């Protein structure tokens, strides 16, 4: 959990910043889970290409933004509960936030956004993930 998930989140965001041409300096984690997640996220951005334009707009991330605001907006993704597809959208959403932070010359926030995601993960998503197989089922599902 905690340590595992934090590693999982920082890997995905680093992977995203790197891929999009940005720096990544500001920073059960089996390489299998990590690789599977990177792929799932690319797959995801391939289809729905909006980039949560309205979510991040409801958020409007600034250095003064508190975790509670992040949580309210992300809860939107989970209106009808949790599932693998939404967990991927979730990582994908955090990724878009980091990119936006960097374009607003607020590199400082990407490490914060990683904390928020890990907290949210451990808090609201782990419960369901553990109940449906753990990250192993994720791996089995996203080769």
From Swiss-Prot:
Motif (BH3) spans which residues?
A: 33-47
The record places the motif (BH4) at 4-24
Chain location of the short sequence motif BH2 per the record: 127-142
Q: Where is this motif: BH1?
A: 76-95
Look up what happens after changing residue 85 to A. Answer: No heterodimerization with BAX
For the keyword Membrane, the answer is yes
Provide a GO biological process annotation: male gonad development
- Entry's Gene Ontology molecular function annotations: BH3 domain binding; channel activity; identical protein binding; protein kinase binding
Posttranslational mods? Proteolytically cleaved by caspases during apoptosis. The cleaved protein, lacking the BH4 motif, has pro-apoptotic activity.
- In the UniProt annotation, what is the result of changing residue 103 to A? No effect on caspase-1 cleavage
Q: Which GO terms describe its cellular component?
A: Bcl-2 family protein complex; centrosome; cytoplasm; cytosol; endoplasmic reticulum; mitochondrial inner membrane; mitochondrial matrix; mitochondrial outer membrane
Asked whether the keyword Nucleus is assigned, the reply is yes
**Tissues/organs with expression:** Bcl-X(S) is expressed at high levels in cells that undergo a high rate of turnover, such as developing lymphocytes. In contrast, Bcl-X(L) is found in tissues containing long-lived postmitotic cells, such as adult brain.
Keywords attached to this Swiss-Prot or TrEMBL record, sorted alphabetically, are: Apoptosis, Cytoplasm, Cytoplasmic vesicle, Cytoskeleton, Endocytosis, Membrane, Mitochondrion, Mitochondrion inner membrane, Mitochondrion outer membrane, Nucleus, Phosphoprotein, Synapse, Transmembrane, Transmembrane helix, Ubl conjugation
Q: How does it assemble?
A: Homodimer. Interacts with BCL2L11. Interacts with BAD. Interacts with PGAM5. Interacts with HEBP2. Interacts with p53/TP53 and BBC3; interaction with BBC3 disrupts the interaction with p53/TP53. Interacts with ATP5F1A and ATP5F1B; the interactions mediate the association of isoform Bcl-X(L) with the mitochondrial membrane ATP synthase F(1)F(0) ATP synthase. Interacts with VDAC1. Interacts with BCL2L11 (via BH3). Interacts with RNF183. Interacts with GIMAP3/IAN4 and GIMAP5/IAN5.
Tell me which family the UniProt entry assigns to this protein. Answer: Belongs to the Bcl-2 family.
Q: What does this protein do?
A: Potent inhibitor of cell death. Inhibits activation of caspases. Appears to regulate cell death by blocking the voltage-dependent anion channel (VDAC) by binding to it and preventing the release of the caspase activator, CYC1, from the mitochondrial membrane. Also acts as a regulator of G2 checkpoint and progression to cytokinesis during mitosis. Isoform Bcl-X(L) also regulates presynaptic plasticity, including neurotransmitter release and recovery, number of axonal mitochondria as well as size and number of synaptic vesicle clusters. During synaptic stimulation, increases ATP availability from mitochondria through regulation of mitochondrial membrane ATP synthase F(1)F(0) activity and regulates endocytic vesicle retrieval in hippocampal neurons through association with DMN1L and stimulation of its GTPase activity in synaptic vesicles.
Domain description: The BH4 motif is required for anti-apoptotic activity. The BH1 and BH2 motifs are required for both heterodimerization with other Bcl-2 family members and for repression of cell death. The loop between motifs BH4 and BH3 is required for the interaction with NLRP1.
Entry protein name: Bcl-2-like protein 1
Top-level taxonomy: Eukaryota, Metazoa, Chordata, Craniata, Vertebrata
List the gene name. BCL2L1
């Amino acid at each position: 959990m905690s340590q595992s998930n934090r590693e999982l989140v920082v890997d995905f965001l680093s992977y995203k910043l790197s891929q999009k041409g940005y720096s990544w300096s500001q920073f059960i984690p089996m390489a299998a889970v990590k690789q599977a997640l990177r792929e799932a996220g690319d797959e995801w951005e391939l289809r729905y290409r909006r980039a949560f334009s309205d979510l991040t707009s409801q958020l409007h991330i600034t250095p003064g933004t508190a975790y509670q605001s992040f949580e309210q907006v992300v809860n939107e993704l989970f209106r009808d509960g949790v599932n693998w597809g939404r967990i991927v959208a979730f990582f994908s959403f955090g990724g878009a936030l980091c990119v936006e932070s960097v374009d607003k010359e607020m590199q400082v926030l990407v490490s914060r956004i990683a904390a928020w995601m890990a907290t949210y993960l451990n808090d609201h998503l782990e419960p369901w993930i553990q109940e449906n197989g753990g990250w192993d089922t994720f791996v089995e599902l996203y080769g």
